[PDB]
Amino acid sequence: ASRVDVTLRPAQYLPWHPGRCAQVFVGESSVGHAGQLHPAVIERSGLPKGTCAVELNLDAIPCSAPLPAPRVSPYPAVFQDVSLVVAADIPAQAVADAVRAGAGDLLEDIALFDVFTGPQIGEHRKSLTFALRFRAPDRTLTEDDASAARDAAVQSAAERVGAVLRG
């Protein structure tokens, strides 16, 4: 509604639950917090269990008037999925940022659809599976060009968050 981008980072800040609390940033400026309230606060205050809350400072959110000019390629897309193993406390957003930075312009869409822990993964690890949609602006993208972009995305995730391609 404000036409700004935000990032949510882990935080500890009463009255929020320290494992379920995000601090909200616009650029590098903090603008508030969100998440689940602290169980001790809920009990002391007579609140319902599981109560959640958000508070943002609207004055710290800069007013924006963007003028988009989207690139809309009509050429066919290539759909590929990639499964990456990382340490269990690596934020999924950081992995997706790494995948995007390496994939380059041919990547049109990235969506996480699976978060998996289990004995076939190992302890202190988790597996993230992303659906990727590749597309070129001037041609029918080949699977090899898409796979090369995918390989560069996997390499970027290796260098930035220690991602290991799932085997």
Partner: protein, 98 residues
């Protein structure tokens, strides 16, 4: 029974049973045993009501001293184990907020 020998023996039996409890469930069983109605420390107090009047002050501050020593140990242990339980809940409930 109100002697400073059977009393201090019962405080010591209680203070080490409290020290050896690593669970709220274990500590609950310890509480009913060393502080409940059938405890030596609680029966020592119910005996103060049938005691001659000239013997209640000299033996009451003794029985009270024994009760307050085991009560202090249980209360500090209950808070310690509850905090450990509560802290463990917060870590177990962590999520990826991104």
């Amino acid at each position: 029974m109100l002697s400073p020998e059977a009393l201090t023996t019962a405080v010591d039996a209680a203070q080490q049973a409290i020290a050896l409890a690593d669970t709220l469930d274990v500590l609950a069983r310890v509480k009913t045993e060393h502080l409940g109605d059938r405890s030596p420390l609680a029966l020592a107090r119910q005996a103060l009501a049938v005691l001659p009047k000239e013997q209640r002050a000299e033996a009451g501050k003794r029985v009270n001293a024994a009760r307050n020593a085991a009560q202090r140990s249980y209360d500090e242990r209950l808070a310690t184990l509850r905090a450990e339980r509560d802290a463990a809940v917060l870590v177990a409930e962590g999520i990826d907020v991104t």
